[PDB]
């Protein structure tokens, strides 16, 4: 499922 990359992609979605 979610890896560090996917979590990081979220950071640029909410910001």
């Amino acid at each position: 499922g979610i890896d560090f990359q996917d979590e990081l992609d979220e950071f640029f979605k909410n910001v």
């Epitope: 560090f4 990359q5 979590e7 950071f11």
Partner: antibody
Framework: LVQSGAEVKKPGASVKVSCQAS????????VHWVRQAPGQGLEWMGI????????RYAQKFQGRVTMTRDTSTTTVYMELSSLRSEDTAVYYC???????????WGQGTLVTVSS | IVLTQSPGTLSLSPGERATLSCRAS???????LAWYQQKPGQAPRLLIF???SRATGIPDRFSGSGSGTDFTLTISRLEPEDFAVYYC???????????FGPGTKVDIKR
């Protein structure tokens, strides 16, 4: 990960280092910029997004750094302003893996600041 | 967010075991700590990621384990190709942190 050559800037000036790569190994992956002072450790500076300039800079280099990506030439650029003696170091560009740590680094670019 | 490495210089002979420790100030999320090896004149090369997962091309002699604030990198048998400087790095996703340790140099005992 081929990078730019040695750069001899002056104190208080700015430097722009390049990191050209293959889009197969970079268009779908994140890139990071690190520096190593002569004889010291590694210092993370920022992260460039897989496409746009979704950069997250470091506090020590906040306001004096600017990272950009060019999808036409598949290159990543780093610009540092207000150069000082403490900024003389070899800068590296590394691609982030799906898990976080950087797997493929670059040759490095020595950024000397003097007369 | 601040990583400390002990020792600063590991004087060991080839064939021996090596233990490098990395103490953090806080807990690393998802045990997101990686160990790197940097050879003189070369760029750093990833050795272990996730505190205990090995990367591609890394030998089984290099073994990693850690949790929270205490992490360790072990080498079963030291070979001449393993003598270099090792670094530990903490990585986070929100917000991206990416902090390194001071650095431990493993040299040939004499």
């Amino acid at each position: 990960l081929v990078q730019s050559g040695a750069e001899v800037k002056k104190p208080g000036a700015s430097v722009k280092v390049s990191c050209q790569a293959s889009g197969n190994t970079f268009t779908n992956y994140y890139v990071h910029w690190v520096r190593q002072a002569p004889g010291q450790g590694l210092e993370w500076m920022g992260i460039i997004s897989p496409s746009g300039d979704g950069t997250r800079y470091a506090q020590k280099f906040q306001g004096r750094v600017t990272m950009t990506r060019d999808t036409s030439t598949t290159t990543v650029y780093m610009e540092l302003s207000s150069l000082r003696s403490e900024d003389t170091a070899v800068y590296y560009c590394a691609r982030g893996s799906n898990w976080g740590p950087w797997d493929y680094w670059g040759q490095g670019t020595l950024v000397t600041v003097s007369s | 967010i601040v990583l400390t490495q002990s020792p600063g210089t590991l004087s060991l002979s080839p064939g021996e075991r090596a233990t490098l420790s990395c103490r953090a100030s806080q807990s690393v999320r998802r045990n997101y700590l990686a160990w790197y090896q940097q050879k003189p004149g070369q760029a750093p090369r990833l050795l272990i990621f996730g505190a205990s997962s090995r990367a591609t091309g890394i030998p089984d002699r290099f073994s990693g384990s850690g949790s929270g604030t205490d992490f360790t990198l072990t080498i079963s048998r030291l070979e001449p190709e393993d003598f270099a400087v090792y670094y530990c790095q903490q990585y986070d996703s929100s917000p991206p942190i990416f902090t390194f340790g001071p650095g431990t140099k493993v040299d040939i005992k004499r």
